């Protein structure tokens, strides 16, 4: 993902057309689904 | 007289074109018109009439 | 760990994200283009080889010290028109690459003939691809190509280009001019010349 | 869509019981040291 | 390994845009009248035998690309929604194909109709753009011939194959007035009076500005068409002498034809020409552009070359795909150590990666798809995805160990 | 840009005389509001499809009302980090969002 | 020059040439009887006043040779605005009075 | 009161609004535009009518 | 043929109105936010906020 930011010229930020969001939605998936999830597991389950 | 005769002969002018922009509906050909051209050599500058 | 703090952090990253979707409306691309700045000059009724030398070459000979830059191409035409497209590195400030070009044209400005000098010369940003084409057509009491092309410019072309981020409006036609069509026979009869 | 699911139909089935899955803490952890 | 390398790589898939455009090109003038007829056969085809697709045609005579003129001409095509054209026979994949077949099949004009490449420009896929530069300071004819030599020699190579054509080529016969300075000066006419009588009466002249119902507009003088259509209309233009005599052109002019190019190009302040080529139904750019380089090296002296809006500059998949996974592979087994200790886990995945890959190339071959900048992100997604399939059984076995 | 090109043209509407119909022979604006429409069509397919393939395997409304509640927050949490330092805020990113989905 | 002359031969020439200025809100005119005109181009609150400075000049440089050689040599000036002074330093006389 | 109370001239004396300009409080600024391309007198009269 | 615009007073889009309700709108979302962080459910979120 992110080391894709060391890209080229006209096919430039097209690899920054992500790897970043796929890190964002990943780091958000690793942070929001870290802080939350366990949160909404104790409340109402069974 | 030398100066004035230079720009009067070493000139790159702008003449139009045969069958121009508003045509006579029925025209078959179109060609850009070249009038005078800029002198290219030391010899052509020699033949400039005063 | 307790959950109500987390179901509050999830309230953010939601209205902080719903605040970023408020970039409504959202553009299609990615500025993938190596940015291009065009210089368009027009010698009225002039041939191809003339505008090549008296207009085109003057501008190219004066392009020195433009920051960044990749290359420059020419289009000295028979219609008496030329446009030099200066392409820059993908990511250069299109606002500063705009003014470098103009401030080298201002060095070659009085070297261009007074026929082409007053005709225009223009330095703007490029795309060569239209976002919209709004056709102004007629439905009754038909005005005509020449009539609409004037009004499309006389009433609403001025309102565009100056608006929200237009590079250059290429209007489909021409606004009116006081057209004088001389007769050489009627000129010669009274011993008169176009002059 | 092809890039994911095409590259997935393997990754799922072909990478759950077959080759370098469980050939990982076994075939290339030790079997040597 | 033998799954791609067999594949042509997709740059970015050229889409149908709900809207496309056509183009028209004519021979050596070839006037606005001669072109409007051709633009009529086009603004007819769409409206006559393609009602269920074409929303509207926007015919523009005297436009084209590469420059204006009485020779070009284009038309913008609007399309009826998207749901109003279901099948492949119904949209711009085949519409342009049977159009190109229907247009260029007959009739005395070059007409195409192409696609919007889903971007501004540069970077088709396998295509190139060659520039032929005058270096030693030769002539135009001593360059167009090197252009001819490299287009007739490049045309004797469809064994390795390439499709090469130039831009706005022409070289139309021009009319040359030759003003005899000695005849004019002795006869009694000003040289400045002659050029204005030829400039204003043939190409028109910008005199001044005037006010038209509120706003300021131009004042042009050009003379009636009747007296500027053909070479014989030059003679009956009379210029006033110093004496007061109406001396016509003929007596100091010399009406000669001779050739000349209507479109001159320059690359970086040097006379230069395109040339716009292809690749081959087999090889692509890396060789298609490479053999073209020494093909131009076996040409006359003072002829150099450059490449523009396709020579990248430095990008694509090649030279960006290996250094892609290079600084990816250093990080791919990195944190396969963070809590996984020594080089025992760093190969648990890192070599699981081509499990994901195998089906990706298979489904991009048994489908007909091609290696693009999304599937080459699918090669990035599935590899990361495998870190919940594979490395998320390793930290279940290592967690059990 | 195109949202205000129409906005400028909208005010010229009434001061026109006879036969001035403004048409759209070429437009790239409705294609874009469809690229947004297809990434709303997709995602909703995913939200529903996940909601279902959780009732299969680990059946229960009160067991699926968790992995499906967690999914919007990470999505709109994505178009939120798009603004900072020196990065973006575009589309081909709403497209690139469907793989991130 | 009169008001209606400068309106057409000077003022309208500049306005007809204002195309492609980045951002921008509106533009007003002041074609006066004294033979003077000033066009005030207002931009969005937060735009670079240094770049909004040069866009304006590089559209004036397109209408520059369309203005008569009487007004062309007289000046034309593109600068940033305030319409409110920070200081006025009056230079007055105390002895051997010089005059206005 | 002392100025405009008498004398044949329009005189005011106002206040600096503690800023550069735009935004008094309850005030407006109306602009009357010639759109169809009428005349000056066919505009000053619309200014007179309004 | 007579149209209209407004300049240096037509804002543009500001003042109190259209800026005072959206002021406390994204204020009220945050005003009972952390009235939960250590204050649990919707029991404290109305202790203040009102």
XYZ file of N, CA, C and O in Angstrom, chain E residues 113-249:
548
model
N -14.151 9.003 -36.332
C -14.947 8.832 -35.109
C -14.217 7.935 -34.113
O -14.110 6.716 -34.309
N -13.712 8.558 -33.050
C -12.894 7.871 -32.050
C -13.548 7.903 -30.665
O -14.723 8.290 -30.527
N -12.783 7.489 -29.646
C -13.270 7.485 -28.268
C -12.513 8.414 -27.328
O -11.300 8.642 -27.493
N -13.249 8.948 -26.345
C -12.649 9.691 -25.243
C -11.948 8.687 -24.330
O -12.597 7.792 -23.780
N -10.617 8.828 -24.171
C -9.810 7.828 -23.466
C -9.969 7.857 -21.940
O -9.098 7.355 -21.223
N -11.080 8.424 -21.466
C -11.393 8.554 -20.034
C -10.433 9.469 -19.264
O -10.371 9.418 -18.029
N -9.694 10.299 -20.005
C -8.772 11.295 -19.438
C -8.500 12.437 -20.422
O -9.063 12.464 -21.536
N -7.643 13.376 -19.991
C -7.220 14.493 -20.838
C -6.483 14.025 -22.114
O -6.961 14.280 -23.232
N -5.339 13.337 -21.939
C -4.579 12.741 -23.063
C -3.451 11.783 -22.628
O -3.709 10.797 -21.932
N -2.218 12.110 -23.022
C -1.025 11.214 -22.964
C -1.113 9.879 -22.200
O -1.413 9.840 -21.003
N -0.824 8.790 -22.921
C -0.803 7.439 -22.349
C -1.986 6.597 -22.784
O -2.927 6.387 -22.008
N -1.935 6.116 -24.029
C -2.986 5.249 -24.567
C -2.878 3.843 -23.981
O -3.740 3.428 -23.202
N -1.817 3.126 -24.358
C -1.510 1.791 -23.833
C -0.207 1.269 -24.435
O 0.810 1.111 -23.712
N -0.256 1.010 -25.764
C 0.891 0.462 -26.484
C 1.426 1.461 -27.517
O 2.396 1.116 -28.289
N 0.803 2.703 -27.514
C 1.107 3.671 -28.586
C 2.326 4.563 -28.327
O 2.763 4.760 -27.136
N 2.874 5.097 -29.460
C 3.983 6.062 -29.387
C 3.736 7.344 -30.194
O 2.788 7.416 -30.997
N 4.602 8.345 -29.960
C 4.541 9.625 -30.658
C 5.965 10.093 -30.961
O 6.685 10.560 -30.070
N 6.359 9.952 -32.225
C 7.721 10.240 -32.668
C 7.850 11.657 -33.222
O 6.977 12.130 -33.952
N 8.944 12.324 -32.865
C 9.224 13.679 -33.333
C 10.526 13.693 -34.137
O 11.564 13.243 -33.654
N 10.455 14.210 -35.363
C 11.598 14.247 -36.276
C 12.117 15.681 -36.397
O 11.462 16.534 -36.997
N 13.298 15.932 -35.835
C 13.813 17.296 -35.665
C 14.924 17.659 -36.663
O 15.835 16.865 -36.907
N 14.831 18.863 -37.232
C 15.918 19.452 -38.016
C 16.976 19.966 -37.045
O 16.714 20.883 -36.259
N 18.165 19.371 -37.100
C 19.213 19.660 -36.119
C 20.353 20.528 -36.653
O 20.713 21.533 -36.034
N 20.917 20.142 -37.797
C 22.043 20.869 -38.389
C 21.616 22.151 -39.108
O 22.462 22.930 -39.557
N 20.304 22.364 -39.205
C 19.757 23.538 -39.872
C 19.591 23.324 -41.364
O 20.038 24.144 -42.169
N 18.945 22.218 -41.730
C 18.657 21.909 -43.131
C 17.447 22.713 -43.617
O 17.152 23.795 -43.091
N 16.755 22.185 -44.625
C 15.547 22.816 -45.145
C 14.293 22.064 -44.743
O 14.367 21.009 -44.106
N 13.140 22.617 -45.111
C 11.850 21.973 -44.874
C 11.691 20.755 -45.781
O 11.267 19.687 -45.331
N 12.034 20.933 -47.059
C 12.041 19.843 -48.038
C 13.152 18.827 -47.766
O 13.028 17.651 -48.135
N 14.230 19.289 -47.119
C 15.298 18.403 -46.651
C 15.006 17.906 -45.228
O 15.917 17.734 -44.409
N 13.718 17.676 -44.959
C 13.225 17.189 -43.673
C 11.966 16.365 -43.920
O 11.811 15.273 -43.361
N 11.074 16.899 -44.763
C 9.871 16.191 -45.196
C 10.255 14.919 -45.958
O 9.500 13.945 -45.981
N 11.440 14.939 -46.568
C 11.979 13.781 -47.275
C 12.537 12.739 -46.304
O 12.477 11.540 -46.580
N 13.083 13.205 -45.180
C 13.512 12.322 -44.092
C 12.288 11.773 -43.358
O 12.329 10.675 -42.781
N 11.209 12.558 -43.387
C 9.901 12.130 -42.906
C 9.324 11.090 -43.868
O 8.691 10.112 -43.435
N 9.547 11.316 -45.171
C 9.143 10.366 -46.208
C 9.963 9.081 -46.163
O 9.411 7.986 -46.329
N 11.276 9.228 -45.935
C 12.179 8.086 -45.817
C 11.840 7.251 -44.581
O 11.948 6.024 -44.610
N 11.426 7.923 -43.505
C 10.948 7.239 -42.304
C 9.416 7.258 -42.220
O 8.819 7.934 -41.354
N 8.804 6.503 -43.150
C 7.352 6.346 -43.274
C 7.117 5.483 -44.507
O 6.032 4.930 -44.704
N 8.154 5.392 -45.336
C 8.199 4.464 -46.459
C 9.153 3.304 -46.159
O 9.037 2.224 -46.760
N 10.098 3.535 -45.241
C 10.976 2.470 -44.743
C 10.360 1.798 -43.518
O 10.504 0.586 -43.329
N 9.680 2.594 -42.689
C 8.915 2.077 -41.555
C 7.681 1.317 -42.052
O 7.087 0.522 -41.313
N 7.311 1.572 -43.309
C 6.202 0.882 -43.967
C 6.637 -0.440 -44.621
O 5.789 -1.270 -44.987
N 7.947 -0.624 -44.791
C 8.491 -1.939 -45.158
C 9.048 -2.664 -43.932
O 10.255 -3.023 -43.871
N 8.114 -2.856 -42.959
C 8.390 -3.540 -41.700
C 7.092 -4.062 -41.051
O 7.047 -4.226 -39.830
N 6.033 -4.333 -41.865
C 4.846 -4.987 -41.315
C 5.087 -6.483 -41.114
O 4.138 -7.264 -41.018
N 6.361 -6.865 -41.073
C 6.773 -8.218 -40.734
C 6.888 -8.305 -39.212
O 6.499 -9.318 -38.601
N 7.427 -7.230 -38.615
C 7.425 -7.049 -37.167
C 6.247 -6.147 -36.784
O 5.859 -6.068 -35.615
N 5.696 -5.479 -37.799
C 4.465 -4.657 -37.721
C 4.541 -3.352 -36.915
O 5.119 -3.306 -35.825
N 3.959 -2.301 -37.510
C 3.746 -0.971 -36.910
C 2.742 -0.221 -37.787
O 2.691 -0.443 -39.008
N 1.950 0.663 -37.172
C 1.009 1.500 -37.925
C 1.342 2.984 -37.751
O 1.001 3.591 -36.734
N 2.010 3.554 -38.753
C 2.521 4.927 -38.670
C 1.889 5.885 -39.693
O 1.783 5.566 -40.880
N 1.471 7.057 -39.206
C 0.883 8.121 -40.033
C 1.264 9.501 -39.481
O 1.395 9.664 -38.264
N 1.442 10.501 -40.372
C 1.798 11.852 -39.931
C 0.586 12.729 -39.594
O -0.573 12.288 -39.786
N 0.865 13.955 -39.093
C -0.208 14.884 -38.715
C -0.301 16.116 -39.621
O 0.720 16.724 -39.970
N -1.538 16.475 -39.992
C -1.821 17.627 -40.866
C -0.801 17.806 -41.986
O -0.344 18.947 -42.280
N -0.462 16.666 -42.610
C 0.639 16.555 -43.576
C 0.573 17.592 -44.700
O 1.335 18.575 -44.686
N -0.345 17.356 -45.658
C -0.556 18.213 -46.831
C 0.766 18.704 -47.461
O 1.715 17.901 -47.676
N 0.810 20.020 -47.729
C 1.881 20.706 -48.478
C 1.227 21.244 -49.749
O 1.677 20.979 -50.869
N 0.156 22.008 -49.545
C -0.748 22.436 -50.614
C -0.126 23.507 -51.511
O 0.581 24.390 -51.019
N -0.389 23.431 -52.833
C 0.068 24.466 -53.763
C -0.422 25.852 -53.357
O -1.628 26.063 -53.192
N 0.523 26.773 -53.183
C 0.223 28.140 -52.772
C 0.424 29.078 -53.953
O 1.196 28.776 -54.860
N -0.274 30.210 -53.952
C -0.089 31.195 -55.009
C 0.899 32.268 -54.572
O 0.753 32.855 -53.498
N 1.908 32.517 -55.404
C 2.945 33.482 -55.061
C 2.955 34.694 -55.988
O 3.279 34.579 -57.177
N 2.588 35.851 -55.432
C 2.723 37.120 -56.139
C 4.184 37.548 -56.031
O 4.778 37.478 -54.948
N 4.759 37.984 -57.152
C 6.134 38.474 -57.151
C 6.180 39.932 -57.603
O 6.169 40.226 -58.802
N 6.218 40.837 -56.624
C 6.234 42.273 -56.889
C 7.623 42.716 -57.347
O 8.599 42.619 -56.597
N 7.697 43.188 -58.589
C 8.934 43.726 -59.139
C 9.149 45.131 -58.585
O 8.447 46.075 -58.967
N 10.117 45.247 -57.669
C 10.414 46.504 -56.979
C 10.887 47.604 -57.927
O 10.572 48.778 -57.725
N 11.640 47.214 -58.956
C 12.172 48.158 -59.941
C 11.083 48.692 -60.875
O 11.144 49.849 -61.305
N 10.097 47.842 -61.180
C 8.976 48.225 -62.036
C 7.989 49.114 -61.288
O 7.404 50.024 -61.872
N 7.817 48.843 -59.995
C 6.881 49.586 -59.153
C 7.397 50.983 -58.798
O 6.632 51.950 -58.800
N 8.691 51.077 -58.496
C 9.314 52.342 -58.094
C 9.429 53.325 -59.262
O 9.279 54.535 -59.077
N 9.692 52.799 -60.455
C 9.784 53.614 -61.665
C 8.406 54.013 -62.193
O 8.257 55.068 -62.815
N 7.409 53.167 -61.940
C 6.042 53.404 -62.405
C 5.299 54.411 -61.523
O 4.376 55.095 -61.986
N 5.703 54.492 -60.255
C 5.220 55.534 -59.348
C 4.233 55.098 -58.280
O 3.312 55.845 -57.948
N 4.426 53.897 -57.735
C 3.579 53.402 -56.643
C 4.387 53.076 -55.387
O 5.514 52.578 -55.474
N 3.804 53.369 -54.225
C 4.434 53.070 -52.942
C 4.334 51.579 -52.635
O 3.277 50.971 -52.819
N 5.442 51.001 -52.171
C 5.509 49.579 -51.823
C 4.585 49.261 -50.642
O 4.028 48.152 -50.548
N 4.428 50.246 -49.754
C 3.505 50.143 -48.626
C 2.040 50.219 -49.056
O 1.165 49.655 -48.395
N 1.783 50.919 -50.161
C 0.439 51.009 -50.736
C 0.022 49.708 -51.420
O -1.161 49.367 -51.442
N 1.000 48.990 -51.972
C 0.759 47.726 -52.675
C 0.369 46.606 -51.704
O -0.642 45.924 -51.907
N 1.173 46.435 -50.651
C 0.965 45.379 -49.655
C -0.349 45.498 -48.883
O -0.914 44.489 -48.454
N -0.822 46.731 -48.706
C -2.104 46.987 -48.051
C -3.261 46.657 -48.996
O -4.273 46.086 -48.570
N -3.095 47.011 -50.275
C -4.085 46.709 -51.314
C -4.173 45.199 -51.577
O -5.170 44.709 -52.113
N -3.127 44.471 -51.190
C -3.102 43.017 -51.323
C -3.501 42.331 -50.009
O -4.116 41.247 -50.023
N -3.149 42.966 -48.884
C -3.460 42.420 -47.562
C -4.904 42.631 -47.143
O -5.570 41.692 -46.692
N -5.383 43.865 -47.291
C -6.741 44.238 -46.889
C -7.818 43.703 -47.831
O -8.954 43.478 -47.412
N -7.457 43.502 -49.097
C -8.418 43.086 -50.120
C -8.497 41.569 -50.314
O -9.356 41.076 -51.060
N -7.610 40.833 -49.639
C -7.545 39.379 -49.791
C -7.632 38.638 -48.459
O -8.365 37.651 -48.339
N -6.885 39.115 -47.466
C -6.891 38.510 -46.136
C -7.701 39.300 -45.126
O -7.889 38.864 -43.987
N -8.184 40.468 -45.549
C -8.913 41.370 -44.664
C -7.969 42.198 -43.811
O -6.779 41.888 -43.699
N -8.501 43.256 -43.207
C -7.698 44.134 -42.360
C -8.480 44.671 -41.168
O -9.637 45.082 -41.297
N -7.826 44.658 -40.011
C -8.365 45.230 -38.787
C -8.082 46.729 -38.797
O -6.929 47.151 -38.667
N -9.132 47.530 -38.962
C -8.984 48.985 -39.003
C -9.057 49.573 -37.593
O -8.046 50.042 -37.057
N -10.253 49.537 -37.000
C -10.476 50.057 -35.650
C -11.650 49.365 -34.949
O -12.144 48.338 -35.421
N -12.079 49.927 -33.817
C -13.221 49.408 -33.072
C -14.411 50.365 -33.153
O -14.231 51.578 -33.271
N -15.621 49.809 -33.096
C -16.850 50.606 -33.107
C -17.846 50.099 -32.062
O -17.759 48.954 -31.616
N -18.792 50.957 -31.683
C -19.808 50.604 -30.690
C -21.066 50.059 -31.367
O -21.624 50.692 -32.266
N -21.492 48.874 -30.934
C -22.721 48.261 -31.427
C -23.693 48.003 -30.277
O -23.458 47.132 -29.433
N -24.781 48.776 -30.264
C -25.835 48.720 -29.233
C -25.372 48.397 -27.799
O -25.905 47.494 -27.143
N -24.376 49.149 -27.327
C -23.895 49.028 -25.950
C -22.424 48.641 -25.818
O -21.647 49.304 -25.070
N -22.039 47.575 -26.540
C -20.674 47.049 -26.427
C -19.791 47.360 -27.641
O -20.292 47.602 -28.744
N -18.477 47.351 -27.420
C -17.497 47.681 -28.455
C -17.087 46.443 -29.264
O -16.758 45.397 -28.698
N -17.127 46.577 -30.590
C -16.818 45.475 -31.505
C -15.923 45.926 -32.664
O -15.707 47.123 -32.861
N -15.412 44.958 -33.421
C -14.371 45.201 -34.423
C -14.892 45.774 -35.746
O -16.094 45.749 -36.011
N -13.978 46.311 -36.555
C -14.296 46.795 -37.902
C -13.298 46.197 -38.900
O -12.100 46.576 -38.911
N -13.800 45.256 -39.726
C -12.962 44.614 -40.737
C -13.336 45.036 -42.155
O -14.508 45.292 -42.456
N -12.324 45.103 -43.017
C -12.515 45.381 -44.438
C -11.766 44.326 -45.260
O -10.562 44.132 -45.077
N -12.485 43.637 -46.147
C -11.916 42.500 -46.879
C -12.237 42.482 -48.380
O -11.506 41.869 -49.158
N -13.318 43.162 -48.766
C -13.812 43.222 -50.157
C -14.682 42.021 -50.539
O -14.500 40.916 -50.019
N -15.625 42.260 -51.452
C -16.588 41.247 -51.901
C -15.886 40.008 -52.452
O -14.822 40.110 -53.074
N -16.494 38.845 -52.217
C -15.928 37.557 -52.625
C -15.674 37.469 -54.131
O -14.643 36.948 -54.555
N -16.608 38.000 -54.921
C -16.531 37.994 -56.391
C -15.165 38.377 -56.967
O -14.808 37.943 -58.063
N -14.409 39.179 -56.221
C -13.158 39.750 -56.716
C -11.923 39.218 -55.982
O -10.883 39.882 -55.940
N -12.042 38.016 -55.419
C -10.930 37.377 -54.708
C -11.008 35.844 -54.676
O -10.404 35.202 -53.808
N -11.741 35.263 -55.629
C -11.933 33.811 -55.675
C -10.794 33.079 -56.387
O -10.372 32.007 -55.942
N -10.303 33.657 -57.487
C -9.260 33.012 -58.293
C -8.155 33.972 -58.768
O -8.364 35.187 -58.800
N -6.974 33.420 -59.134
C -5.775 34.146 -59.595
C -6.001 35.277 -60.607
O -5.175 36.193 -60.696
N -7.094 35.204 -61.367
C -7.406 36.222 -62.370
C -8.038 37.466 -61.739
O -8.076 38.532 -62.358
N -8.528 37.316 -60.500
C -9.103 38.428 -59.744
C -8.021 39.310 -59.115
O -8.332 40.334 -58.509
N -6.759 38.902 -59.257
C -5.620 39.689 -58.775
C -5.343 40.861 -59.716
O -5.072 41.981 -59.266
N -5.426 40.592 -61.020
C -5.106 41.569 -62.061
C -5.942 42.836 -62.063
O -5.415 43.930 -62.306
N -7.242 42.694 -61.792
C -8.170 43.830 -61.842
C -8.249 44.651 -60.544
O -9.204 45.406 -60.336
N -7.246 44.498 -59.680
C -7.088 45.365 -58.515
C -6.144 46.513 -58.863
O -4.965 46.296 -59.158
N -6.679 47.731 -58.834
C -5.939 48.915 -59.262
C -5.418 49.725 -58.077
O -6.155 50.003 -57.126
N -4.140 50.094 -58.149
C -3.484 50.889 -57.109
C -3.165 52.281 -57.653
O -2.649 52.418 -58.766
N -3.480 53.307 -56.863
C -3.255 54.698 -57.252
C -1.773 55.069 -57.240
O -1.067 54.831 -56.255
N -1.317 55.649 -58.348
C 0.070 56.079 -58.503
C 0.293 57.481 -57.929
O -0.660 58.149 -57.494
N 1.557 57.913 -57.930
C 1.937 59.243 -57.452
C 1.424 60.348 -58.376
O 1.151 61.465 -57.927
N 1.303 60.027 -59.664
C 0.757 60.952 -60.656
C -0.758 61.076 -60.486
O -1.331 62.153 -60.674
N -1.389 59.959 -60.127
C -2.843 59.864 -60.026
C -3.388 58.801 -60.961
O -4.577 58.797 -61.285
N -2.507 57.899 -61.392
C -2.857 56.838 -62.333
C -3.303 55.558 -61.636
O -2.717 55.148 -60.631
N -4.344 54.936 -62.183
C -4.798 53.634 -61.708
C -4.002 52.510 -62.362
O -4.424 51.924 -63.368
N -2.832 52.234 -61.778
C -1.959 51.166 -62.244
C -2.358 49.849 -61.573
O -2.357 49.755 -60.340
N -2.711 48.831 -62.382
C -3.070 47.512 -61.855
C -1.838 46.687 -61.475
O -0.702 47.138 -61.693
N -2.069 45.491 -60.919
C -0.985 44.597 -60.500
C -0.114 44.134 -61.671
O 1.083 44.521 -61.746
